[PDB]
Amino acid sequence: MKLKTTLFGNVYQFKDVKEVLAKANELRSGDVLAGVAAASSQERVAAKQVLSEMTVADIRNNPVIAYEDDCVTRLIQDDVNETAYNQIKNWSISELREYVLSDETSVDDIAFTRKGLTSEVVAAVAKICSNADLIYGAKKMPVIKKANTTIGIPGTFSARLQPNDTRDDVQSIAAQIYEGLSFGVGDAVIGVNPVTDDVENLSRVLDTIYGVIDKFNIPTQGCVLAHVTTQIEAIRRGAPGGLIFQSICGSEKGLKEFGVELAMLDEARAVGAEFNRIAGENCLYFETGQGSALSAGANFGADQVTMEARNYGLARHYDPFIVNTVVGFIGPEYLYNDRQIIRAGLEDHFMGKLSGISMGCDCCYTNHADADQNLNENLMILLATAGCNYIMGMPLGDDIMLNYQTTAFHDTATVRQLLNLRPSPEFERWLESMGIMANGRLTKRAGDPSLFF
Amino acid sequence: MKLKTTLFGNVYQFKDVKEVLAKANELRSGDVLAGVAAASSQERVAAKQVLSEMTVADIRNNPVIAYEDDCVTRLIQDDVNETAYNQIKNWSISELREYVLSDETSVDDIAFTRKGLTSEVVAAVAKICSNADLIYGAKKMPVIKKANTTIGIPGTFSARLQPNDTRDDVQSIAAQIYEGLSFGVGDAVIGVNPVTDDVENLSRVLDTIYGVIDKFNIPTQGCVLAHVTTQIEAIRRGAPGGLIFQSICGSEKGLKEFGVELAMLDEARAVGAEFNRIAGENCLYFETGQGSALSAGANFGADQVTMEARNYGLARHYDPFIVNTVVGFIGPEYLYNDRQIIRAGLEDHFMGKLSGISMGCDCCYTNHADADQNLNENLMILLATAGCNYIMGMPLGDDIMLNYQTTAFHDTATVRQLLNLRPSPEFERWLESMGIMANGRLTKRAGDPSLFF
Amino acid sequence: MKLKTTLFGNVYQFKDVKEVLAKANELRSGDVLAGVAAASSQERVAAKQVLSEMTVADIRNNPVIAYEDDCVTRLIQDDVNETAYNQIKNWSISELREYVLSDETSVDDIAFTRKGLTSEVVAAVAKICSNADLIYGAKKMPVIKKANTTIGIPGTFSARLQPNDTRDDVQSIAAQIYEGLSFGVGDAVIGVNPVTDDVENLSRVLDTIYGVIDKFNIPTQGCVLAHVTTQIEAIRRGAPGGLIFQSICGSEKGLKEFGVELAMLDEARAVGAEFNRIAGENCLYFETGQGSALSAGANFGADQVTMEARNYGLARHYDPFIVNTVVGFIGPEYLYNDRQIIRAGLEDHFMGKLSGISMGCDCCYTNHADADQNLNENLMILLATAGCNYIMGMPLGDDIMLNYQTTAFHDTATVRQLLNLRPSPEFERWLESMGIMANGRLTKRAGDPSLFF
Amino acid sequence: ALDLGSAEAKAWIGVENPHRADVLTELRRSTVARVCTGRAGPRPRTQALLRFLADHSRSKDTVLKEVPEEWVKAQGLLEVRSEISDKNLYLTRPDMGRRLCAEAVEALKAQCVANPDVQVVISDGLSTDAITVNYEEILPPLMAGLKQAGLKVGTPFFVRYGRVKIEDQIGEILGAKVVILLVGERPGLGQSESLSCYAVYSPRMATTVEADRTCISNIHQGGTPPVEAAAVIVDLAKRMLEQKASGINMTR
Ligand code: B12
Ligand code: NA
Ligand code: NA
Ligand code: NA
Ligand code: NA
Ligand code: NA
Ligand code: NA
Ligand code: NA
């Protein structure tokens, strides 16, 4: 391979594949902080061309962290279909981009081809895509999973109901659930980040969620987003199991930062299969987001996009029901503004779909970043046209306890009625019987939690 | 009428309606330049609330430039259906916003209500809309016109083929036409900004466009975007008349700057009716964009959003086939970056639709602005979801003579296939008979201008 | 041009285009009275052949009344698209007939071609059409307009509710409105010919009509068919404006007979636009009928068909929501029997559609003509298959005050259910919600005015 | 081993299974526009995107690029400036680049001829390259034409950070019957050489509007050649002095 190109008569040389992959990124505050970003637009473009010219082999054989050094690298590499890899290993990344985007490449074509990819190769493709490339490419790569709802079917759009409370007060939690359900939110999951990471508390929250599910016979699933170890404890001890959640990171060191062993995810699958109230075969929920590895000093000189792609590669091993990036969850140090957050969301979603996972996005931002609610509205609509599997919902997007702004319950109804998309078909049935939705639209009496009393 | 409120215990008072309209705007480059922007975030919110509390009557009765002093104000005021106005004059702008957005407000409801607005009221409404408000509100207000194609039908999406050349070289112009047609661009118009504004040259450029239309029997229309007087001349003297074009401004002073008298637009309509090769009843084409008035010293202390909306009140009087903003055509001084250009595009489009015109957008930026091609792709997709009637198309979006970047031919095909939207129905039929489109998608043979040879 | 043919060896010469146009008519009592009719069937046919051989130019340049002598001639001629005229001016009338009737001539084709016609040319075509030609030709020329209802869409059939009372008694008027609405009549208009032509009375009638419209929120419009001057007075003075009505005539002298200035129609458009409760852009209502010019001594030697065509040419200038001929309204002196009245109705409707106006027909007759109710039933069904825009309705067809018989409320339901046609889509929605109509058919509880109490 | 700025990169035809590839070469030659690059589904081919992005990097650089005062001093031109002090402020304050700074006025009154028939004024405006690349070729023959068949030729000078409307103040201070302005227009994606001329008969700040100007845009080797443009400007000038009018007040 070449690590060198000339552009307008000036030679642009790079040290290694890693450097090329980093500098090819669109500018973000994260890559600058990590000190891996291009020096100018010229060198950004030169890196893109060098990358576009490397083969699948070139990139597959040069992972950011070495096989024998990193359990996540080993997981990713060990999961390759070597027959699919052998068909494409001599393709340039340029050629792989064009393949993904081609109207003559079908869903079934991509289904086999994607098995010959590693996360690094997935990343390389994302790096040479425009914003429209990322949206259109992602849209022609649907990924459908099933718990008690079916998510990911083209023409549909799901949503997590996020009824968080600063005190985990079951009244406040319930209040927001009735509100979200009235806007048709919750077909992805009813998921709470709890305050105490504690068996008694987890079951109490879970009991709260499932009290509403069981009372109205809602086709959905509940989740409490504490450490995977504590959710497993609670479910083993009798609490209702829906989805089992873990945050992940794309290196072994990253996982250690989070207190996560791979064997915990094995165990979560096993517990799911013994205990969980799930009809379909998918029951895991992962969450990701650009900058985690960097925060943990676990990026090993790699840009945050390449690292984020490694998360999806890890996730794919466990066939989760849903994954989402929490796109602007941390702050300006990794993603500074509107511009950069939109790009990252489009990148994250496209890479997730290319990796063949059930990829959603928490379109969100924080109050110390250069961002506002109009950003979340721009981004949610773009991602929806990309076939984004699901977004979040809270009352007006205000999390009273995680201290950021995500999408409103309003925003899911907006997206759905704007783009003629429907909920998960099972959930849509339930909304119709409750008189909340007719022909994909909120009825006159929707958006009113007192409807449930 | 209250020109004051209290936010967090602080009293916010404004001089007049005009100040309220200015300081309610989301932050942009041009407002700061005009000296009319908010001093802080709180004051912007306070201006928004004060404005939301004003009545339709409050705003209608305080145009930005006086009736007696401004022929554009007169035109807008004299066009009001006073019976519709009387129904709504006691509504607050907040109640009008909520009415526009309501799913119980139909297209026919809005049909009558909008006749009671003036542009200042249109603008007021826009100022208290979030980005998703502007998109969803615009989408539920379709505006449909008909030349040789029908434009604006929900579920369709049209494009201007902009085959501009540095020398007006008929070979270069023809080359770009064939290329654009191969991507399904040109259902809005095939429209050239010429280098020389003389009759012989205008006739030659028209002869070039119509040579192609006539040879392949394309259902569409041509246009040469010179001064309206010169077009009229050419057409009277025998050139093929399609659409008649004029750039406009929202004040009488601004029109003077442009060299345009209202009588010229009357005449253009008369000339269209006697000469033009148009089946339907619409044949005018206007172009607008935020900053034009301010540049012309013709905003009289009003902001660029309020002034832009007045462009639409003017245009509506002449029932044009199409109108578009050229959203980022000028430079960073009026709209600085991605964020500001997107917002402006959503505003302009929402305001045009609310004014009842056939509103499209040239999603574009300049090289001295903090913007890139990813911006055009973000905005074009958002505007498509909003039911934007049309965008532009140039090869890769690079205009070799107007020195800016607009959308590529690729972008229209992308938008159509991403959102399952169709061209104008008459043009779609033509594309299918050419073997260029099947079921709304580019065939294998598409995208190759050599197909016409 | 030739004004001469030989037929079975006998030379048939004619004086001028006017003579040819008159004698080409199918026999009617009117042309005999006017003294312009053929002397035999042979000379009728010879005139038809001579006419069929003249060009569009021949006829366009020879109007029944000269440009400088007649304001209606000037209106008609000044409205020609000279580019469309230049394409067809060398066609024979034979060739224009065949063009109109061709299955390869589309609605869009006719849309442009019709702009190159004058009323005289429209007449010439009608004169060489059989009854089936007139029906099929008219059917392939839809003309769609919109007030608060949409009229003219193929597959639909509208109706004027005509609740006239000898004393303008608001109870009698209201009684017939509830009756008509119960049969699904009124989507065209609720139109009253009043007894007193007087502001207080007009507003009282209008108040009556709109009381029913406003109470049941009916998507329609009301009208009082007094002189246009008095309707304008009343509407200016605060009465509800729906459609503004004027009877018209195809010469300047004819208009003088009726006390109509062209500037009154200009003013009615302007008043409509300031005052009227109309969502769409059409608000005028014209009425015509063979023999008016003759009655007024204003035919200037022209047959009544050619004169009637000049009415449509006048009407087209003002883009009315609806026009109808009042086919048998006057008496046997102009149209003697069944035969002649059917022919005239088919002629009037075809010419109206060819002129590009929203053409309906009052299928009616008088008690001194050789005619009965079975005539109205024959004619209404034929015209309905022709795509006639609307007919009238009164209780059983008996006007208690204009002293003639039009169509029953029954007849609109009959036509609709016979031919699988629907009401204006907006009105159909309203009938469905009232439980009057289901799938285009009157429900069990329709035809009962007490349904409204 | 492709340089994206190379002539080869520019002439690249990317249509996959073209109906008539010989036509595509002909078409690509017809135009400087980015035709015949083909597609991947509905999206641009990778190479076309890459060159676009490469050109864009170069374009941005030309926006902020300034002429040395060493270069203008060597042109023997007087240098003056608007109220603007730098490139960053120029981009954000149009109102300031439309006004002379208070020492500009005093330099012009002390160093330029009063009341000329024709005044040439030169500014970098939005693209330095437009005047640097074009200058030796347009400027001399222009002011040759004006004296060679003509009359009172004013003394030419450079306005830094200028915008077109600054020529109205200039015409008032010098009492010019005609003012002609060569100014860089905003840079395009692939080109920054494009020069325009904005000319007015007897302008006044308080009265003259934009339509009172005649524009001649797209001056450069790839549009209207500088030598040739200079002759059309000389012609225009003398027609303005004859007609006592410019732009939208000039016959045919
Ligand atoms: C930007 C721009 C505008 C802006 C205004 C200027 C601005 N940018 O702030 C807006 C969007 C208002 C605009 C409007 C119109 N413009 Co303009 N404009 C341009 C453009 C793209 C840039 C010029 C530039 O950068 N100048 C250099 C900078 C440094 O000067 P500035 O002080 O910042 O800007 C001044 C000039 O741009 C001037 N100007 C801009 N356009 C025109 C047109 C004419 C005829 C005149 C006399 C002056 C003029 O107005 C500004 C003063 O505030 C050129 C295309 C090009 N290749 O240059 C077309 C261009 C100059 N405009 C053109 C035209 C015709 C128009 C319009 C008449 C409508 C139309 N048909 O498009 C209107 C009204 C023009 C007028 N009489 O004022 C033509 C001029 C042809 C000619 N020789 O007569 C051009 C050349 C493009 C084209 N090929 O059609 N335009
Ligand atoms: Na359990
Ligand atoms: Na960090
Ligand atoms: Na005044
Ligand atoms: Na009234
Ligand atoms: Na008579
Ligand atoms: Na330039
Ligand atoms: Na030029």
Side-chain angles (χ1 to χ4, degrees), chain A residues 156-281:
Chain A
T156 71
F157 188 75
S158 293
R160 164 168 173 210
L161 214 168
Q162 186 161 312
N164 295 340
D165 187 73
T166 78
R167 302 151 330 298
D168 289 340
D169 172 283
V170 298
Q171 304 279 255
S172 162
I173 287 172
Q176 299 170 74
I177 292 175
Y178 295 121
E179 182 95 351
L181 300 169
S182 77
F183 277 87
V185 172
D187 50 339
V189 78
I190 307 171
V192 173
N193 315 82
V195 172
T196 45
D197 193 62
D198 154 49
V199 167
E200 193 197 295
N201 186 59
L202 296 181
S203 316
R204 169 166 64 239
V205 171
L206 287 177
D207 275 0
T208 304
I209 289 162
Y210 275 87
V212 179
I213 298 177
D214 279 354
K215 172 178 206 199
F216 297 103
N217 291 317
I218 321 175
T220 188
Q221 44 281 332
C223 183
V224 71
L225 288 74
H227 206 262
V228 73
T229 58
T230 63
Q231 300 173 62
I232 282 166
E233 213 179 348
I235 285 164
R236 275 193 195 282
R237 285 164 165 178
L243 301 193
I244 304 185
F245 167 82
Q246 189 45 61
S247 248
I248 53 181
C249 206
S251 66
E252 197 169 336
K253 194 188 167 170
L255 286 183
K256 294 184 173 159
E257 180 91 300
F258 282 7
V260 166
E261 301 173 18
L262 256 32
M264 294 177 186
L265 306 177
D266 289 345
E267 190 194 3
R269 269 237 262 205
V271 159
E274 174 172 1
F275 289 101
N276 286 31
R277 299 183 24 179
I278 301 294
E281 296 294 285

Side-chain angles (χ1 to χ4, degrees), chain A residues 26 103-104 130-132 135-136 139 337-339 342-343 346 370-372 374 377-378 380-382 385 414 417-419 441 444, chain B residues 26 103-104 130-133 135-136 139 337-339 342-343 346 370 372 374 377-378 380-382 385 414 417-419 441 444:
Chain A
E26 295 302 289
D103 294 327
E104 317 299 317
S130 80
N131 279 15
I135 290 156
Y136 187 82
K139 172 67 167 178
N337 48 21
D338 290 37
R339 170 176 309 153
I342 287 161
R343 178 63 190 193
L346 293 179
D370 183 48
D372 67 12
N374 288 328
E377 298 178 8
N378 288 349
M380 85 201 188
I381 291 172
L382 296 167
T385 71
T414 297
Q417 296 174 196
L418 184 74
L419 297 175
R441 298 156 84 72
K444 270 187 124 153
Chain B
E26 291 307 297
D103 294 327
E104 311 298 325
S130 72
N131 283 16
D133 296 338
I135 292 161
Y136 186 90
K139 176 72 176 149
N337 51 20
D338 292 34
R339 185 186 299 167
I342 290 166
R343 179 65 193 191
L346 301 177
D370 196 356
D372 64 21
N374 289 335
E377 302 175 4
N378 286 343
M380 101 207 171
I381 292 180
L382 289 169
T385 72
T414 290
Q417 301 174 195
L418 182 76
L419 300 176
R441 303 164 77 73
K444 295 185 76 131

Side-chain angles (χ1 to χ4, degrees), chain D residues 16 25 65 69 106 112 114 146 152 159 165 189 211 243:
Chain D
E16 288 262 26
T25 316
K65 162 200 251 262
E69 33 280 355
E106 300 295 316
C112 282
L146 293 165
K152 200 167 169 171
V159 182
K165 287 179 139 69
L189 211 203
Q243 290 175 2

Side-chain angles (χ1 to χ4, degrees), chain C residues 33 291 294-297 333-334:
Chain C
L33 174 67
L294 185 28
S295 177
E333 65 271 43
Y334 303 125

Side-chain angles (χ1 to χ4, degrees), chain B residues 257 367 369 398 410 414 443 448, chain D residues 19 34 38-39 43 165 187:
Chain B
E257 178 96 327
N367 300 301
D398 176 10
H410 294 80
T414 290
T443 62
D448 170 18
Chain D
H19 190 245
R34 295 167 199 266
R39 64 197 185 85
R43 304 296 319 146
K165 287 179 139 69

